[PDB]
């Protein structure tokens, strides 16, 4: 792959992380040495068992490593390791939606089923996913019962709790974390690092805005809109 294979060369990476997405929408990864990865591999692919989407079939589907883009040096891990978030899942014959259905291929299908309809050449999606960051989170479910607890310094209810560094008293009140200044915000540098990592991954620009969402411990980072099968990967 012009992108991937060249990136491998430039990075001097020894490891290539094939990443795909399960039906439930959870990214999965398997790691190969660079030696096995050739241009032909993008065509031929690397084969593997099916244990999430499928079963009983004893399915030996192939991970057709997709090539353009999603060729990102693994920002977090130690050894130089690019990722190929682009790994469409293909059946052995009928190069198609593997297992029950590979989401990425379903999306590729829809990509075609827009030009084919002659309605449009491309479709653009710009998601605004919100997340919470906690210090720590605990839960268990037994016959004894079901229990779950949220733990965070920034949590609205953490006033009155004891801390090592002491309690600042500067924390968002309930619903009232809409953009107050850093004493209480207690994120910022973290969001910044998140943004920096994003740029490492997808590319320069791409990151629009970072702010604190309303709920205590709730943060939003904005990423640029893109086409499907691109934005989806992003």
Q: Does the annotation place 199 within a ligand binding site?
A: no
Q: 171 or 230, CB closer to other proteins?
A: 171
Residue numbers of the site for other proteins (CB under 8 A)? 159, 169-171, 173, 180, 183-184
Which residue number, 77 or 169, has a Cβ lying nearer to other proteins?
A: 169
Q: Alpha-carbon torsion 223, 199, 151, 172, what sign? A: negative
Shortest distance (Å) from residue 202 CB to other proteins: 35
- Least Å from the CB of residue 182 to other proteins: 11
The residue among 197, 204, 196, 188 whose CA lies nearest residue 76 is 197
* Residue 173 or 175 having the CB closest to other proteins: 173
Q: For the chain, how many residues are written?
A: 234
Q: Which is nearer to other proteins, 85 or 184 (CB)?
A: 184
Smallest gap from residue 46 Cβ to other proteins (A): 54
User: What counts of helices (H) and strands (E) characterise the chain?
Assistant: 5, 14
Q: Smallest distance from the beta carbon of 155 to other proteins, in angstroms?
A: 14
Give the span between the Cα atoms of 230 and 69, in whole angstroms: 8
Q: Is 213 marked within a binding site?
A: yes
Q: Are 32 and 15 in contact (CB under 8 A)?
A: yes
Left, alpha or beta for 153 (phi > 0: left; psi -120 to 50: alpha)? alpha
Q: How far is the CB of 201 from other proteins (least distance, A)?
A: 35
Q: Is 130 annotated as a binding residue?
A: yes
| Residue 193: strand, helix, or coil | helix
Using an 8 Å Cβ cutoff, are 19 and 81 in contact? no
Judged by beta carbon, residue 122 or residue 159, the one nearer other proteins is: 159
Does 220 count as an annotated binding residue? yes
**Which residue positions form the known binding site for Mg(2+)?**
128, 130, 213, 220
**Which residue positions form the known binding site?**
128, 130, 208, 213, 220
């Amino acid at each position: 792959a012009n992108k991937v294979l060249q990136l491998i060369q430039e990075s001097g990476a020894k490891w290539v992380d094939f990443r795909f997405t399960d039906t439930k929408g959870k990214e999965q990864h398997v790691t190969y040495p660079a030696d096995s990865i050739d241009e032909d591999t993008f065509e031929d692919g690397k084969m593997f068992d099916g244990s999430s989407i499928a079963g009983w079939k004893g399915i030996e589907a192939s991970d057709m490593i997709l090539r353009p883009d999603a060729e990102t040096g693994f920002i977090d891990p130690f050894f130089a390791e690019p990722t190929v978030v682009v790994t469409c899942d293909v059946i052995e014959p009928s190069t198609g939606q593997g297992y029950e259905r590979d989401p990425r291929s379903i999306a590729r299908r829809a990509e075609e089923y827009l030009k084919s309809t002659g309605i449009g050449d491309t479709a653009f999606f710009g998601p605004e996913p919100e997340f919470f960051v906690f210090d720590e989170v605990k839960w268990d479910i037994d016959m004894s019962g079901a229990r779950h607890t949220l733990i965070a310094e920034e949590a609205a209810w953490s006033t009155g709790k004891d801390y090592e560094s002491g309690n600042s008293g500067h924390r968002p009140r309930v619903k009232g974390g809409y953009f107050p200044v850093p004493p209480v915000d207690s994120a910022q540098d973290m969001r910044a690092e998140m943004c920096a990592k994003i740029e490492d991954i997808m590319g320069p620009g791409r990151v629009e805005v970072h702010h604190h969402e309303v709920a205590s411990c709730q943060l939003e980072i904005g990423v640029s809109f893109n086409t499907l099968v691109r934005k989806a990967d992003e």
